[PDB]
Write a protein that binds this ligand. Structure first.
Ligand SMILES: CC(C)(COP(=O)(O)OP(=O)(O)OC[C@H]1O[C@@H](n2cnc3c(N)ncnc32)[C@H](O)[C@@H]1OP(=O)(O)O)[C@@H](O)C(=O)NCCC(=O)NCCS
Lengths: 427, 427
């Protein structure tokens, strides 16, 4: 009915990486109890707010399907409460930076003694045992540490950060694989495990195709399909030409295909006026004829300077310029619909405005209107996994300490034991 | 002792998205049996080969921990073998493009009739029921459909793809979450499920913070922390300033922070000839004092134009421009180490060559040497999740059809039948 119904998650996480993971577990039915610092709670609450003294969108789009309890974990009575909650939890999730939980008294070793069944899941910057184990890491630092930044953007520009959250949310989703894997192993052992994802490794996993390319480069000295391998196409900022004579580490390739077969980002009508008025167009080698028909170049079906991967390298960027020319007069949608007639893989650059209001994404539950009576409704990204046997029921993100008392009742605490704790500045 | 021990995966997948997912399952212990086209098989085998007549690195770095059987599924005899295999399978992963398996005869409904326990997992371009459900989609096409390209690169350049495989490996990791969540649910119901991830939605899920930004922009007309909101810093290509006056959809922000904590990509010594000689440098709020001592500008500790996020977010670029000057004569690693002395969140852009031979990434098992006695050893990325109770065991990718016979014999077949199928050109 819902894969994580009845899994309870003691969630210590803050910001993006850890909360993204617990939220998505929440969307699959887990009972996520989020533990927050007394007074402020999760930073994201006060970051980039749109209305004052209202939880930010940063917070709400990463914290639906959870309850909040405030807790000072430095206090004798808070540690006592934690022990009870650990005994009821299936997974504890944390992204606190190294040794921190151990310093609260909750080493993996003691946790095992409190609940041999509980899984301990962590996000960190670097793996345990890495020389950089101790370094401090946010989204873009991890994109840098993991290879994305070096391999993204252009040959004549800097390393470029990706808009997508290659380091926070992607670590989050990786962690969520770890957690589920550990739940799968517990069915056979009766025991919990420790599991950790490092932002660098999560990034690296997504840039695995670039570690393909580094080895290709080391062994052959060239990467035929990169723009720098087309003679006198690519120039550094001083007008000097670029080739694989000089390159010993995988370079930026602009809008080249990557793991996609050859491709490029082509202008559509209005690109001067509209930043996102562009398609991506792919030359699959198996599609050469189809493409010649579309662009009205029958002469290129048989010329061997044009009809194999190999002949095409001499000229790839000239081909792409010539295709661009046909799109000169059509918006990205006309171009995608035209391309689709030929089966060619080609699609528009969707702007975020287009995405936030697309009827298709709301039909399938991928953009979702969350009903929030307190802060006002708001959009969010649902579950990118679709299942035959159930639908996520997303509900609004918790207010600070909203559920503190309700959670203490589920633990078995009389109403005056709760009164004590508020006054003691534990909760 | 290995989370997917005894899970049997009927793997139909090719290229990157699907295989990434089944490979990672194989690392966690799954019995992955890859079905391949008679004669050529997975097209990655012959795409960017480094040695002739040898499976490429693209194939080997996405197809460890699997066996190969060749099979013609359009044949009566091959459908019969498929039915037998589906009855032994726990999960059946596919990325064929829509309706394809249904046309082979294996609709979800017949599959259930064969095995009410099997999970059917799919990668698709767009979600079932989306207007674009039928479009063909590779890596960078999905990056475009999902919002990443629109929000990646610079305000004065084109939408830009990421070097990270946001569309393929990303999608395959999200699928892997769907698969594990379905295995968790099957312990409770005894039943399999259908599960699908669309590349558009996998991308969009990593781009959630950009949906936060769209809504902030819609509600307030401005994004204070984006470069375009510091007066006269940002210019479009032909001499004209840029502001949020004109911007209704989240724009490209160069190497801005992404979140609530501003950062930039900063030149280090050697940048004019070394593409990856840069550092990312994040102004955390709490860390401004320490930033002021590393810099040796102590005037900024009490100047309110300088010591608050509100004070800071109109001179932000001037500030990075001056921190950058401190780094002109030091490298990457020097700068980072200077910055760790103050717990400042700063790190190097790692190059792919630095990462390919980094000793830490090899010690923690994230870059792993694969022992491949037929093609030569090669590197690959291993498990990004680290577990206290087991270690993945990485084992080389299969030769086309290497395991056909072996797998037919596990299907209870007879050595006469086997040699008949080879001859009948079905295997
Ligand atoms: C995000 C990150 C950089 C934030 O750093 P930070 O502002 O220093 O916050 P910390 O996580 O280190 O926690 C602050 C301290 O207060 C403690 N603390 C936090 N909440 C508490 C509470 N509810 N009660 C008592 N103590 C608490 C922590 O144990 C920690 O203790 P310490 O002084 O012994 O180190 C850090 O958590 C991190 O690098 N984690 C891994 C990677 C990551 O998630 N970063 C990207 C952000 S999405």
């Amino acid at each position: 009915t819902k894969p994580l119904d009845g899994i309870n998650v003691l969630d210590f996480t803050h910001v993006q990486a850890g909360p993204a993971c617990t939220q998505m577990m929440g969307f699959l039915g887990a009972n996520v109890i989020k533990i927050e610092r007394r007074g402020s709670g999760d930073m994201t609450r006060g970051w980039l707010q749109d209305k004052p003294n209202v939880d930010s969108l940063y917070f709400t789009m990463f914290n639906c399907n959870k309850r909040s309890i405030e807790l000072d974990m430095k206090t004798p009575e808070g540690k006592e409460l934690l022990e009870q909650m650990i005994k009821k939890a299936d997974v504890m999730v944390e992204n606190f930076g190294p040794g921190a939980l151990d310093r609260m008294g909750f080493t993996w070793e003691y946790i095992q003694e409190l609940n041999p069944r509980v899984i301990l899941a962590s996000v960190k910057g670097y793996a345990e045992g890495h020389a950089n184990e101790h370094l401090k890491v946010y989204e873009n630092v991890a994109q840098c540490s993991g290879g994305a930044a070096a391999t993204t953007g252009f040959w004549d520009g800097p390393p470029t950060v990706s808009g997508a959250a290659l380091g926070d949310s992607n670590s989050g989703m990786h962690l969520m694989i770890g957690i589920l894997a550990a739940l799968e192993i517990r069915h056979k052992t009766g025991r919990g495990q420790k599991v950790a994802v490092a932002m660098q490794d999560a990034v690296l996993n997504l840039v695995r195709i670039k570690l393909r390319d580094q080895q290709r480069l080391e062994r052959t000295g060239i990467l035929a399909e990169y723009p720098q391998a087309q003679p006198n196409f690519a120039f550094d900022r001083d007008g000097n030409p670029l080739s694989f004579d000089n390159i010993t580490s995988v370079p930026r390739g602009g809008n080249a295909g990557g793991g996609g077969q050859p491709g490029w980002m082509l202008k559509c009508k209005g690109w001067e006026t509209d930043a996102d008025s562009y398609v991506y167009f792919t030359i699959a080698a198996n599609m050469w004829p189809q493409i010649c028909d579309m662009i009205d170049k029958p002469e290129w079906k048989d010329d061997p300077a044009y009809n194999t991967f190999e002949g095409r390298v001499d000229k790839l960027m000239d081909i792409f310029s010539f295709i661009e020319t046909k799109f000169a007069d059509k918006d990205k949608f006309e171009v995608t619909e035209w391309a689709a007639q030929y089966g060619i893989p080609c699609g528009p650059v969707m702007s975020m405005k287009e995405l936030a209001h697309d009827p298709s994404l709301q039909k399938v539950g991928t953009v979702v209107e969350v009903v929030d009576e307190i802060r006002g409704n708001h959009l969010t990204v649902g579950a990118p996994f679709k299942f035959s046997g159930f639908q996520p029921e997303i509900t609004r993100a918790p207010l600070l300490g909203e559920h503190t008392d309700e959670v203490l009742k589920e633990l078995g605490l009389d109403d005056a034991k709760i009164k004590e704790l508020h006054a003691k500045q534990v909760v």
